[PDB]
What we know:
A: Phosphorylase Kinase, domain 1; transferase/peptide; transferase-peptide complex; insulin pathway; transferase serine/threonine-protein kinase
Amino acid sequence: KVTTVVATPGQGPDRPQEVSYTDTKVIGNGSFGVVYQAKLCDSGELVAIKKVLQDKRFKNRELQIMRKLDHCNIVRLRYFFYSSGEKKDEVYLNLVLDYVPETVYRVARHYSRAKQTLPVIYVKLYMYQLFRSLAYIHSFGICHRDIKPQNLLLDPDTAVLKLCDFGSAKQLVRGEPNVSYICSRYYRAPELIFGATDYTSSIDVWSAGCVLAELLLGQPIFPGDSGVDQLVEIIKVLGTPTREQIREMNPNYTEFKFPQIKAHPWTKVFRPRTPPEAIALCSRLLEYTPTARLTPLEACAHSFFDELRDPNVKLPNGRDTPALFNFTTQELSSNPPLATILIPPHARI
Amino acid sequence: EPQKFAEELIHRLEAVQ
Ligand SMILES: N#Cc1sc2nc(N)c(C#N)c(-c3ccccc3Cl)c2c1N
């Protein structure tokens, strides 16, 4: 069963071309609409296809964002095309994406079930690549807002990571309201829980820290049932936020009772073998004040990732590391002098 | 909303200590 459609290149010239695919299999449910796997007849390559319902009366936000993005650490929009069906009367937007075989969730769950933690070398590789993608999208003012282990795709052999699913992504601008009920509770920034409409891209950074901690711990650091229990889990570790911190999150909560609760030491949080720099990175990712959190680019330059900038560093399978040093001007636009650290001498010329 | 939410939050902290 072979399907032939007229598709438009994702970031391309905007000249539609005929594309044929086959072997349609369901991968799972994306943010909005389900995700299929398929094989391009021409190349033989595997792709992911997220079919979403499109309303003819307005433009698709995800599509607008996706056509801007080209990055090694982000799942790329190969093509897009339209189709109809499902009671008809409407049109579906089909996003043809890179196919990637694995997720951090599946890998983390694979180690946790064996009562083990992911080797620090993978934690370094995966987190660094996530921060790069974050640094890239935030430079367009674009906030992913879905950051979580399930949306972190992996190639197990090459150890390449790719951020995926921008169905919740928004381009943020000063003076506009945004839904405070967003992300996923375990990875939801505290200001979001306070119902702050004014939040920035720093919320993705918070989520990243939650992922980092989870990979160190072996479980989500901030569990719990209600959205209000989420805040309880956070203060059980970070301690009751100061008045000045509440102000920086949601000013509408500045004066309130809020019983003082001692912060649980970061070193007592993780297992005794946990690297010091891993703990320092995590502590600078998770802060009540969003402005106090590291920028993704700053995170990349953190001492925790110094092992990746070693000329002799290799994967546990003997293969070379993926390209970590390939930063463009757009990636570095937030802090160009950081390249002095980010791009090691051995990768300069 | 703000005073309402802070009241069910402050309660669950009296329960944690
Ligand atoms: N937009 C978009 C894409 S492309 C893609 N590709 C994948 N291989 C996987 C996986 N697993 C996913 C995925 C991730 C989290 C939850 C559900 C799904 Cl289907 C996606 C996904 N959401």
